[PDB]
Amino acid sequence: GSKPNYALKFTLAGHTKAVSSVKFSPNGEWLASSSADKLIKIWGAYDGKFEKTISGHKLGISDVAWSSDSNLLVSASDDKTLKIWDVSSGKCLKTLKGHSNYVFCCNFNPQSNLIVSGSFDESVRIWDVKTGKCLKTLPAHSDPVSAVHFNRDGSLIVSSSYDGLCRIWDTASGQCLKTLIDDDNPPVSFVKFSPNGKYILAATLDNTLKLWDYSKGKCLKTYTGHKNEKYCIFANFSVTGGKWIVSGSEDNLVYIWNLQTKEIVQKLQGHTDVVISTACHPTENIIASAALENDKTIKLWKSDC
Numbered sequence: 098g099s100k101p102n103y104a105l106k107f108t109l110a111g112h113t114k115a116v117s118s119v120k121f122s123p124n125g126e127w128l129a130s131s132s133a134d135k136l137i138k139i140w141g142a143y144d145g146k147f148e149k150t151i152s153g154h155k156l157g158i159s160d161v162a163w164s165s166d167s168n169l170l171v172s173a174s175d176d177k178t179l180k181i182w183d184v185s186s187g188k189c190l191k192t193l194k195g196h197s198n199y200v201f202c203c204n205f206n207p208q209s210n211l212i213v214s215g216s217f218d219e220s221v222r223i224w225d226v227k228t229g230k231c232l233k234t235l236p237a238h239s240d241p242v243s244a245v246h247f248n249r250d251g252s253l254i255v256s257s258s259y260d261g262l263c264r265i266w267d268t269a270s271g272q273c274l275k276t277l278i279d280d281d282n283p284p285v286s287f288v289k290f291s292p293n294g295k296y297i298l299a300a301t302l303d304n305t306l307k308l309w310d311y312s313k314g315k316c317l318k319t320y321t322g323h324k325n326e327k328y329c330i331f332a333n334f335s336v337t338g339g340k341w342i343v344s345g346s347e348d349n350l351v352y353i354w355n356l357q358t359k360e361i362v363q364k365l366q367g368h369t370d371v372v373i374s375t376a377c378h379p380t381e382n383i384i385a386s387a388a389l390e391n392d393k394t395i396k397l398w399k400s401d402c
């Protein structure tokens with residue numbers, strides 16, 4: 098149909114503090130969740146079946162991300178480290194040390210030979226996956242780094258910060274290519290590249306999402322109607338059915354917009370706290386959503402469209 102009809106299929110309980118992030122494995126089999134409870138949990142994407150707990154961080158986790166081959170995870174923790182995990186064994190392969198404050202955000206490149214991280218220490222770091230060594234420290238921002246993401250060929254990194262900036266970095270040199278958003282305020286709470294790498298989706302803590310043309314440095318679309326003044330809420334491109342933008346909201350709902358028209362096409366009700374994180378299944382019309390401390394659950398929603 099022209100609009101989605103997402104309906105609740107499963108509620109995934111087990112975290113003992115706020116959930117911080119959910120991400121589907123690229124092969125579609127798994128959902129990974131991270132939590133302030135210091136744990137990663139792995140769940141079946143299709144039936145919500147609890148698979149395993151992955152443990153080792155000494156403080157809460159803000160983010161987790163999958164390698165391209167679905168075999169590895171990287172997590173970002175308040176313990177000032179990232180950890181690379183073998184999903185099959187649950188073992189920590191590498192501990193990435195160098196940040197001087199909470200690690201907030203992380204991602205693999207498409208090649209999955211590099212990890213990018215952002216920290217409360219106001220830096221972006223680029224790490225070698227094989228050795229766990231820090232290759233580059235970028236003095237990226239002047240306040241905590243809220244998001245980091247590689248583009249589809251891995252040649253670019255986009256970063257965002259509470260300093261109000263969005264910057265694009267040349268991966269190879271670590272040098273800045275452009276400052277896409279250059280305001281004192283509001284905080285830029287989330288950024289990522291579009292699937293094709295031509296656009297950047299950016300959240301600001303004034304209840305606004307924007308789709309930017311990277312090359313032209315111009316705003317193409319604005320999405321509003323949700324509540325986002327405090328938390329670094331993820332946003333997604335939904336591409337399996339209709340072309341949507343998806344985001345959590347501080348009114349405890351999942352918002353779904355038509356990417357082209359900017360109209361709200363669905364609001365998913367059921368969580369009892371802020372929806373901090375949403376993820377879109379790579380092949381099926383499935384959304385995962387996760388909520389803060391009142392709720393501490395993940396919900397799986399399925400649409401015909």
Ligand SMILES: CC(=O)N[C@@H](C)C(=O)N[C@@H](CCCc1ncc(CO)[nH]1)C(=O)N[C@H](C(N)=O)C(C)C
Nearest residue numbers: 115116117133157158159160199201202243244329
């Ligand atoms: C472990 C922890 O909570 N660390 C502090 C520093 C924190 O505030 N982390 C944030 C992480 C939000 C999720 C996120 N990761 C990456 C993005 C976008 O790139 N968004 C938070 O709101 N935590 C919640 C809070 N402060 O209430 C909960 C999960 C404790």
